[PDB]
């Protein structure tokens, strides 16, 4: 699947989401903890989607079908702990986008990543603005 720095960067950025979620899960909607967790998780998750976008662009002319599909596989995997935090249809968002634009090319991964980033931003904005 993924090789080289693309493998290192994407895996680390995906692990940064699960580290923060595990941080919140044992650190200590109108609940001020659910609100802050969604803002925190979407911040680090968005960084991961940007890295997905950057690495796909870098691999546009040289990446293979299996490399790009592995980036979607990572996006699907990181959507599960994000959905368990209360961001519903997070998995469906990336899974439906993969059906419309299958991740066999860099452009296909970018389309998937665009919808994932947009979803993560709406959740980030709605929860942050509720803090007030």
């Amino acid at each position, epitope marked *: *699947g993924l090789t080289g720095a693309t493998k290192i960067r994407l895996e680390r950025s995906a692990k940064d989401i699960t580290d923060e979620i595990d941080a919140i899960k044992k650190d200590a909607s109108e609940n001020p903890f659910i609100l802050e967790a969604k803002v925190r998780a979407t911040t680090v998750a968005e960084k991961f989607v940007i890295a997905i976008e950057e690495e796909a662009t870098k691999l546009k002319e040289t990446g293979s079908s299996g490399e790009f599909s*592995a980036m979607y596989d990572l996006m699907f995997e990181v959507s599960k702990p994000l959905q*368990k935090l209360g961001i519903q249809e997070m998995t469906k968002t990336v899974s439906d986008a993969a059906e419309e634009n299958p991740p066999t090319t860099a452009q296909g991964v970018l389309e998937i990543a665009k919808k994932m980033r947009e979803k993560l931003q709406r959740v980030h904005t709605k929860n942050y603005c509720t803090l007030k």
Partner: antibody
Framework: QVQLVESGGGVVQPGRSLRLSCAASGFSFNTYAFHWVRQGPGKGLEWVAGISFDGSKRYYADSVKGRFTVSRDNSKNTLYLQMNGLIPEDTAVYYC??????????????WGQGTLVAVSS | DIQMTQSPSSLSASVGDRVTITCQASHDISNYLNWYQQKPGKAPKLLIFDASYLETGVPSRFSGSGSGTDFTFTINSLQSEDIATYYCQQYDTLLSFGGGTRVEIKR
């Protein structure tokens, strides 16, 4: 037209090894992850092993972890399951299944007919 | 791990009845839950995916609901051909099945 044909079932003495294979045609074999599910005689379904669309991730149930290994060969469009140190509780019909979704590991969508393994002397 | 407990173990319903089956997950699994139907002598067939979405080609009489730990599978008008054992399946942590529910037909 999807077909999955398991093979390799029959009698194997306890504590020995048996290998199971599964043919693919016809679909995009490299697109999908695969699962192994077994069903003892008169018993329920037990998910045993799974492998991602690339062979980079393999997953095993606690009952077979460290004893079973699952592999794929995209060139031959076949899925493999190595069974070491067999015990009579492994007696079941083993099903090879293709994942319902593309790429990801979510759920066995298309199943084979299953092959019967009899762990007996 | 994640323990899937299915209920009832078996039931008897007449043709036309509304059959309901419950799955319970030991931990939160969101909606990463599927429902399978295994007719006698056959391999299991997926009917509901992601706990509430009907698979393409499945008759409308089957449905599913639930999220988190408690899940429900329903057959709106039970048909004679519907006799099978029904299994829930989670994919939150690895994959695993429930013990299954045997559906017999009262005639």
């Amino acid at each position: 037209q999807v077909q999955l044909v398991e093979s390799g079932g029959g009698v194997v003495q306890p504590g020995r090894s048996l290998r199971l294979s599964c043919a693919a045609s016809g679909f995009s074999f490299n697109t999908y992850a695969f699962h192994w599910v077994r069903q003892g005689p008169g018993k329920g379904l037990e998910w045993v092993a799974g492998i991602s669309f690339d062979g980079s991730k393999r997953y095993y149930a606690d009952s077979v972890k460290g004893r079973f290994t699952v592999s794929r060969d995209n060139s031959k469009n076949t899925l493999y399951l190595q069974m070491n140190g067999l015990i009579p509780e492994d007696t079941a019909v083993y099903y090879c299944a293709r994942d319902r979704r593309i790429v990801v590991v979510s759920a066995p969508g298309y199943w084979g007919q299953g092959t019967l393994v009899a762990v007996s002397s | 791990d994640i323990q899937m407990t299915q209920s009832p173990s078996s039931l008897s319903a007449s043709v036309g009845d509304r059959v309901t089956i419950t799955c319970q997950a030991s931990h939160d699994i969101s909606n990463y839950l599927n429902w399978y139907q295994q007719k006698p002598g056959k391999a299991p067939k997926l009917l509901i995916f992601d706990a509430s979405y009907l698979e393409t080609g499945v008759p409308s009489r089957f449905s599913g609901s639930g999220s988190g730990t408690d899940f429900t599978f329903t057959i709106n008008s039970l048909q004679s051909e519907d006799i099978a054992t029904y299994y829930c399946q989670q994919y939150d942590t690895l994959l695993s099945f429930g013990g299954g529910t045997r559906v017999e037909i009262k005639r």
